[PDB]
Amino acid sequence: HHWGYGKHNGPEHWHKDFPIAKGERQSPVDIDTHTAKYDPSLKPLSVSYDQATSLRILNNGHAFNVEFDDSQDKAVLKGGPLDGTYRLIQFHFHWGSLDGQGSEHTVDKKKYAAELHLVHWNTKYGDFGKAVQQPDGLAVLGIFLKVGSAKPGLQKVVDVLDSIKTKGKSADFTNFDPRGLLPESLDYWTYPGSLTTPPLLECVTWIVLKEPISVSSEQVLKFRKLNFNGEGEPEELMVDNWRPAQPLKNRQIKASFK
């Protein structure tokens, strides 16, 4: 049946239903740090999350999403490589069964334990569903997670995960401040790519921060207690929900920093 992360429905199979899997601007990629070019004309990112309104957290069977009210310019990303204003719609993570894997992007082939994606759509397209049909429709801010000290601003997410263990469960999730998930520095790499899951649409400006955040072993362990299945279906732990790096093809990764 449907796409997933198993042997039988995982990333090597996706191209049969989503032929853009083999396209010219797929994500994630390996970020070769020596080959990335500093682009002095890239602007600082502007992350404006002070008025963010989180609403709900949802296990969609592939990851969990913390969803936001995106019906006004409440949490926006601008600047950097972007033209215009991009509104935060949701964030989610990808993680591993082991601390040695889990990120989608890699840095000089290094895999991190997990990767956070803050997903934003270009307000010139009016809604997310129209934006994903455009080559500049989305901006995803990607942040690596390494295991060490706890991230105190992650704990409220971790603690609600027992309430959304299985596919299709949701829970109210108000007043969560996504600024507590960011590193100190906003230095980044950027390149044009895609959604990393089906439908794999080539609509994303990727902005990947150089500085990882640290999370504790106990925090990532709780992500690994989630289930891909629905309640009353056989239990399959939600782990290794990452797509491996895809060919860079005719793209250059730019760096905001030297």
Instruction: Supply the minimum distance, in Å, between the C-beta of residue 195 and ligand FBV.
Output: 4
Residue 47 binds which entry of Zn ion, ligand FBV, none, CB below 5-8 Å type-dependent? none
Residue 119 binds which entry of Zn ion, ligand FBV, none, CB below 5-8 Å type-dependent? ligand FBV
Interaction between residue 47 and ligand FBV (CB under 6 A): no
Q: Is 152 left (phi over 0), alpha (psi -120 to 50) or beta?
A: alpha
**Residue 253: Cβ-neighbour burial (10 angstroms; 0-12, 13-18, 19+):** buried
Closest residue to Zn ion using C-beta atoms: 117
For every residue of 162-219, which 3-state class applies, written as one string? Answer: HHHCCCCCEEECCCCCHHHHCCCCCCEEEEEECCCCCCCCCCEEEEEECCCEEECHHH
Interaction between residue 120 and ligand FBV (CB under 6 A): no
To the query of whether residue 62 is one of the catalytic residues in this protein, the response is yes
Interaction between residue 195 and ligand FBV (CB under 6 A): yes
Interaction between residue 117 and Zn ion (CB under 5 A): yes
> What is the widest separation between alpha-carbon atoms in the chain?
54
CB-wise, 78 or 117, nearer to Zn ion?
117
Asked if residues 60 and 167 have their Cβ atoms less than 8 Å apart, the reply is yes
- Using the rule CB under 6 A, give the single segment among 155-163, 175-183, 191-199, 247-255 that binds ligand FBV: 191-199
CB-wise, 15 or 216, nearer to ligand FBV?
15
CB-wise, 142 or 212, nearer to ligand FBV?
142
DSSP conformation letters of 47-72: EE-TT--EEEEEE-SSSEEEEE--SS
Nearest to 78 by CA among 116, 49, 115, 105: 49
The answer to whether the annotation marks 13 as part of a ligand binding site is no
User: Cα 100 to the chain's mean position, in Å?
Assistant: 18
DSSP helix/strand/coil, 102: coil
Interaction between residue 213 and ligand FBV (CB under 6 A): no
Instruction: Supply the minimum distance, in Å, between the C-beta of residue 34 and ligand FBV.
Output: 26
CB-wise, 25 or 117, nearer to Zn ion?
117
Of the residues 13, 34, 62, 105, only one is catalytic, namely 62
Contacts 24+ apart (CB under 8 A), 126-132: 128/70, 128/89, 131/203, 132/195, 132/199, 132/201, 132/203
Tell me which of 58, 113, 114, 140 binds ligand FBV, using CB under 6 A.
140
The answer to whether the annotation marks 123 as part of a ligand binding site is no
Asked if residues 250 and 236 have their Cβ atoms less than 8 Å apart, the reply is no
Q: Which residues are catalytic?
A: 62
Known binding positions for substrate:
196-197
Known binding positions for Zn(2+):
92, 94, 117
Binding site for ligand FBV (CB under 6 A): 117, 119, 140, 195-197
Binding site for Zn ion (CB under 5 A): 117
